Design a protein around this ligand. Sequence first.
Ligand code: HEM
Ligand code: HEM
Ligand SMILES: Cc1cc(N)nc(CCc2cc(CCCN(C)C)c(F)c(F)c2F)c1
Ligand SMILES: Cc1cc(N)nc(CCc2cc(CCCN(C)C)c(F)c(F)c2F)c1
Ligand SMILES: C[C@H](O)[C@H](O)[C@H]1CNc2nc(N)[nH]c(=O)c2N1
Ligand SMILES: C[C@H](O)[C@H](O)[C@H]1CNc2nc(N)[nH]c(=O)c2N1
Ligand SMILES: [Cl-]
Ligand SMILES: [Cl-]
Ligand SMILES: [Gd]
Ligand SMILES: [Gd]
Ligand SMILES: [Zn+2]
Lengths: 401, 402
Amino acid sequence: FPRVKNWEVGSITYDTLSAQAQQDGPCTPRRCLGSLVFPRPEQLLSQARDFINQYYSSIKRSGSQAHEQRLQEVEAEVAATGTYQLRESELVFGAKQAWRNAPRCVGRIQWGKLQVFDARDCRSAQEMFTYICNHIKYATNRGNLRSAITVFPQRCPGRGDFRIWNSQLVRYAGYRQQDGSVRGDPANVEITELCIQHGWTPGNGRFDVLPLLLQAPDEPPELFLLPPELVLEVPLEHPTLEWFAALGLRWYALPAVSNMLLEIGGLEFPAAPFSGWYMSTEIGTRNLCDPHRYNILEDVAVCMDLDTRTTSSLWKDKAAVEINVAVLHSYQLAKVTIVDHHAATASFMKHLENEQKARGGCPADWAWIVPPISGSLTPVFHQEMVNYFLSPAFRYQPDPW
Amino acid sequence: KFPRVKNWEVGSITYDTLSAQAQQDGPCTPRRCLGSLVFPAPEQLLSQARDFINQYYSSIKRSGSQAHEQRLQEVEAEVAATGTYQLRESELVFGAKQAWRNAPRCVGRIQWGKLQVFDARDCRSAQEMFTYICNHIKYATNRGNLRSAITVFPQRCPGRGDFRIWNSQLVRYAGYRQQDGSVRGDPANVEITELCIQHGWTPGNGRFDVLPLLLQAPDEPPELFLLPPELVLEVPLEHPTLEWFAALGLRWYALPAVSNMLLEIGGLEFPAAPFSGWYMSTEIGTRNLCDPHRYNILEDVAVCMDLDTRTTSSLWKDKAAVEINVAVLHSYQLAKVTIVDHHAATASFMKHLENEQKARGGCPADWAWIVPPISGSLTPVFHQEMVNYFLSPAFRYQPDPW
Ligand code: HEM
Ligand code: HEM
Ligand SMILES: Cc1cc(N)nc(CCc2cc(CCCN(C)C)c(F)c(F)c2F)c1
Ligand SMILES: Cc1cc(N)nc(CCc2cc(CCCN(C)C)c(F)c(F)c2F)c1
Ligand SMILES: C[C@H](O)[C@H](O)[C@H]1CNc2nc(N)[nH]c(=O)c2N1
Ligand SMILES: C[C@H](O)[C@H](O)[C@H]1CNc2nc(N)[nH]c(=O)c2N1
Ligand SMILES: [Cl-]
Ligand SMILES: [Cl-]
Ligand SMILES: [Gd]
Ligand SMILES: [Gd]
Ligand SMILES: [Zn+2]
């Protein structure tokens, strides 16, 4: 049982929940690989059994009546069919657990408040689009964002999978050049040239919302144009830097991850988009200032008349703070839900305290919980953390092409 | 099967083959990663010794030579006759540099080859220890043009207690427990402050009172030594445009000299071997001054800046911290005392990683310690996957001698 210390307060806890760690991680006694982004059949019944036990534990209902009853049914279902179906309440329970188990998510204080749309009877990419359109409408909610997941049919042998080829439901185009440089978002150059390959008339803008490439089983993807009124965006302005608006920056309201695989009780859902609301550093620090993303830092510094000729002026740090200010200001003025990294980390510390008493610990990935600016100014920096894998879970998966 | 490592800013991919040589074991398992935790027999002495001797003879292009096997035999024979062995002077220099080179938590390692090694393994007493330490401070400080150095005191050996420096650094500010339970001065130094008083030091009552040294010779109580004031170079903190900042009365010292770590070379242990370089500005401006459990000045500065401190979304904390770090950089430059900002230091560390990939096939690095505590993703090391592991020679933590 690893001892874990908080260095701001001096308090000590023990992560006994780590003792239940499932699939192995990438680290060994000889070397730590914790900073890497991607870590390098009656088994279905062992995973389903454990998940069923998880479910009845939470509702205080282990070891009586409906517990064993549900245990025999999954056995019989897998015996007769090779797989099984989750009850709607279990699907709801599994989706919230997978979020609760996500070591890289700093917003898990919200994990109990999640709206689950059950799309396991979807039949075509046409239907997907209507589902995705329903999700976006619900989650966006005129700017009062609501956490939501839409769960499409599970993987089954013999047939292809449902897949959303985009990494997010809302992404901006990345247009290559005669000279290699990119207009738009460099992170989406690949899917941009895919969408263009499947017939999408490209734009000429820095912030063109890409179409969706949606894949029903055993069929090639189909392009769908997202209804422009369904995509809520926020023009970025600064509260006092009048010229900031003239930079023409914008970002969208809804962060909806559409390329991760949801795994519950041994079942796999390769199409299960989930959405919450943004922490402001995600937009203002990573999306806008990463060198391989929009890389706007020096343009803002020039406008601020900062001395970009010496690193020790801290011009980078100054421009970054004002970009993050512009993001928070713009989203608040638009009445679109957003949370700053100070508020989010303080709530995560509360979440850790809750999870200590509820489960004996919390899987947390320090490198991803600590925000990309002002790290040691937040309480999570001074909190030791233990990282490990539990099921239900959101897993990474290969791109479908 | 060597770890593949990606840089996400550029797209580069390398393989850390050096990691396959990790001489000891860390805290992680395939079950769980503990990377974020702060604190993670003749035959076995011989095999450590043999490995270090192999390293040294490789470095001087004498691998497998007459002199190489001769040294191996000399060490085998001394361990059999005495239980231990003595390093040659050139082996100690090589081993101290390698220990720095191998330190996973040091972002300053582009400098590792430029290290001045003072051999004090002949030191006899705590009074001689104090004289060696004073000369280290004088050489390293160099009137503000700082020079990296280490002074190596006698090794742990059978029959005798250890040399120990009780202070965690050679220069440290007292922390006076008080009665709100509050601390005046540096809260990190409350324990050592109380030990100094208990050992005859007449305390002060300021926030920046330089501590005396508590020096321990083999099998003796520690002995208290005051640092000659003209050896301790300090920098008053001012801000280039916020003129009220000087009235805070803040100061920091020029020389970061870690004095409580253990230096291990070929199985030999040097419990006393203080080493010093020069500061990265975030160490002072962000950690020492802004940590809630250190001087904790952030809110006071933000109030003086007229920032709105009743809402987090004003980013008042971020804005005050940036100006504190500016103050440190400006003040050390004004004083002509070496200091490196977090952008230049992380840029130089990336070149070190590239140098090391060609030289050794990798580089042990602790991502959480390498990425600066402010502006993390604005520096190139944020975007660089790293592999953490333990090579020897090495600097190691050791328990406090009390
Ligand atoms: C509601 C407010 C939420 C906030 C403030 C939030 C915040 C964050 C942040 C900042 C990250 C870091 C990822 C990055 O840097 O790109 C993250 C990761 C993650 N979040 Fe959340 N999130 C929220 C909702 C959700 C929901 C509703 C789910 C799932 C049901 C979820 C699942 C995840 C997962 C799986 C990751 C890991 C991403 C990856 O490894 O690629 N989050 N979250
Ligand atoms: C010359 C310029 C140097 C710079 C800019 C530098 C920078 C740093 C920084 C920023 C840290 C993080 C520690 C903290 O946050 O408190 C560190 C750690 C460390 N440095 Fe360096 N350093 C330098 C010289 C040296 C030298 C000369 C040595 C040894 C000969 C050394 C060995 C170490 C070790 C062992 C650690 C780990 C300390 C610990 O974990 O307690 N450094 N360094
Ligand atoms: C629901 C949600 C709310 C929120 N507030 N934030 C996120 C963040 C997810 C995310 C994860 C990653 C990691 C890799 C991505 N996949 C394609 C490999 C990103 F890079 C990224 F930009 C990104 F937004 C999700
Ligand atoms: C030569 C050198 C140059 C430089 N630029 N920086 C350092 C910083 C070392 C350091 C390490 C730690 C880790 C904890 C171990 N200690 C408690 C025994 C500190 F806490 C600390 F304050 C501290 F300065 C050293
Ligand atoms: C190389 C490094 O692991 C990589 O840049 C990680 C670091 N921490 C992160 N943390 C978050 N939240 N998101 C990220 O994309 C990353 N990237
Ligand atoms: C708990 C956490 O590991 C701790 O605060 C670490 C994180 N990274 C650090 N990095 C550096 N350079 N110095 C530190 O003291 C720490 N502290
Ligand atoms: Cl994003
Ligand atoms: Cl320090
Ligand atoms: Gd102007
Ligand atoms: Gd002024
Ligand atoms: Zn690890």
